[PDB]
Amino acid sequence: DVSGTVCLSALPPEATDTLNLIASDGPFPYSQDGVVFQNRESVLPTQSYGYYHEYTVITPGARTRGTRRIICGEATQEDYYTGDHYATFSLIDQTC
């Protein structure tokens, strides 16, 4: 399940950066950005393979990719934010 919706302005600024990179099709800082997200645990709604893709949301000061990500769905404005390494997700509202 998805936890609820969160305004983009309420997430860390790096989330805004990732969405802008997604809009321009990169380039992305990490080679893992843009791979398919399999939704193996069925946390997000069931969709065909490849409907979801994952992108890094940089964690300031981290040596690794960290735990923040944006998962896009194929639908218009369907983007989910996770700050706990895919445990929970919120839908991002880019209008607020």
Curated annotation (Swiss-Prot):
Signal peptide span: none
Enzyme nomenclature, EC number:
4.6.1.24
Show the catalytic activity: [RNA] containing guanosine + H2O = an [RNA fragment]-3'-guanosine-3'-phosphate + a 5'-hydroxy-ribonucleotide-3'-[RNA fragment]
GO molecular-function terms, A-Z: lyase activity; ribonuclease T1 activity; RNA binding; RNA endonuclease activity
Q: Which CDD domains match?
A: RNase_Sa
Gene Ontology CC entries for this record: extracellular region
Q: List the disulfide bonds.
A: 7-96
Q: Name one Pfam family in it.
A: Ribonuclease
Sorted alphabetically, the keyword list is:
Disulfide bond, Endonuclease, Hydrolase, Lyase, Nuclease, Secreted
Q: Which InterPro entries match?
A: N1-like, Ribonuclease/ribotoxin
The reported effect of residue 39 to A/D/S is: Decreases protein stability
Q: Where does it reside?
A: Secreted
**What protein is this chain from?**
Guanyl-specific ribonuclease Sa
